[PDB]
């Protein structure tokens, strides 16, 4: 037995309103028997042991999401999942299938900052191709994928924390804007709900810090039409990519 903030960060209203037991069922109902025998749906607790073995509140664990979408969308809307409709398929709510294959779902994935001697982070192989944003997230709740599946976790190096129903814009602190793997701007979200005691945003004299506002003239750059968070096509690197 433990305390969790569960789906507090969710933007999708029908998910945000349902009882935690129902959302837990949606996430686990499709798991095979062999998986169920050794797995438990482990929501991140309100107080957790972080990747440097320091005990922190869930809201002080530095999460990262790599995303093609720019601040004019993401700081406005937060992270809205691909599937928002009220009666999704079982494939679209399954945490195991989502963790494995990254198919369209109710989940917004993030990856934990791996705080060693230096900062490391799971980084997608295509982080150096086209326009890429690294969003910095400090959110309540969510599901710890590795804790849930242990040996059966599909991509353990991603250290995924999954948010059914998405992540509100108030939990996104900043964004690094990369063009073909070269950092252009560090974006500051003015509506970030600061929990206090966080490390100050990692900066450089060469790269401008920009306070975002709605429809910022430089805030809508994107590739022309979830690739960057597929656990299969990335690996752990020092958390200075773009510098």
From TrEMBL:
Q: What is the lineage of its organism?
A: Eukaryota, Metazoa, Ecdysozoa, Arthropoda, Hexapoda
What are the UniProt keywords, alphabetically?
Answer: Apoptosis, Glycosyltransferase, NAD, Nucleotidyltransferase, Repeat, Transferase
Q: Name one GO biological process term.
A: apoptotic process
Please give the coiled-coil regions recorded for this protein: none
Q: Which family does it belong to?
A: Belongs to the pierisin ADP-ribosyltransferase family.
The range of the complete sequence contained here reads 6 to 256 of 850
One GO molecular-function entry: glycosyltransferase activity
Which protein are we looking at? Pierisin
Note whether Repeat occurs among the keywords.
yes
């Amino acid at each position: 037995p433990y305390m969790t903030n569960g789906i507090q960060a969710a933007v999708v209203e029908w998910i945000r309103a349902l009882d935690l037991e129902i959302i837990s069922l949606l996430l686990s109902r499709a798991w095979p028997m062999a998986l169920l025998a050794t797995s438990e749906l482990r929501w991140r607790p309100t107080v957790l042991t972080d990747t440097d073995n320091v005990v922190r509140l869930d809201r002080r664990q530095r999460l990262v999401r790599w995303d093609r979408r720019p601040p004019n969308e993401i700081f406005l809307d937060g992270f809205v999942p691909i599937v928002t409709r009220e009666n999704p398929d079982w494939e679209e709510t399954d945490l195991y299938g989502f963790a494995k294959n990254n198919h369209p779902s109710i989940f917004v994935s993030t990856t934990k900052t791996q705080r060693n001697k230096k900062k490391y982070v799971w980084t997608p192989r295509n982080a150096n191709r086209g326009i890429v944003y690294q969003y910095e997230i400090y959110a309540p709740g969510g599901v710890d994928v590795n804790d849930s599946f242990s040996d059966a976790s599909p991509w353990p190096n991603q250290m995924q924390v999954a948010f059914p129903g998405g992540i509100q814009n108030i939990y996104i602190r900043s964004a690094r804007e990369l063009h073909n793997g070269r950092i252009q701007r560090i974006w500051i979200n003015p509506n970030f709900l600061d929990p206090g005691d966080l490390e100050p945003i990692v900066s450089s004299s060469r790269t401008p810090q920009v306070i975002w506002r709605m429809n910022h003239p430089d805030g809508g750059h994107r590739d022309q039409r979830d690739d960057l968070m597929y656990g299969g096509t990335g690996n752990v690197q020092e958390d200075t990519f773009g510098d």
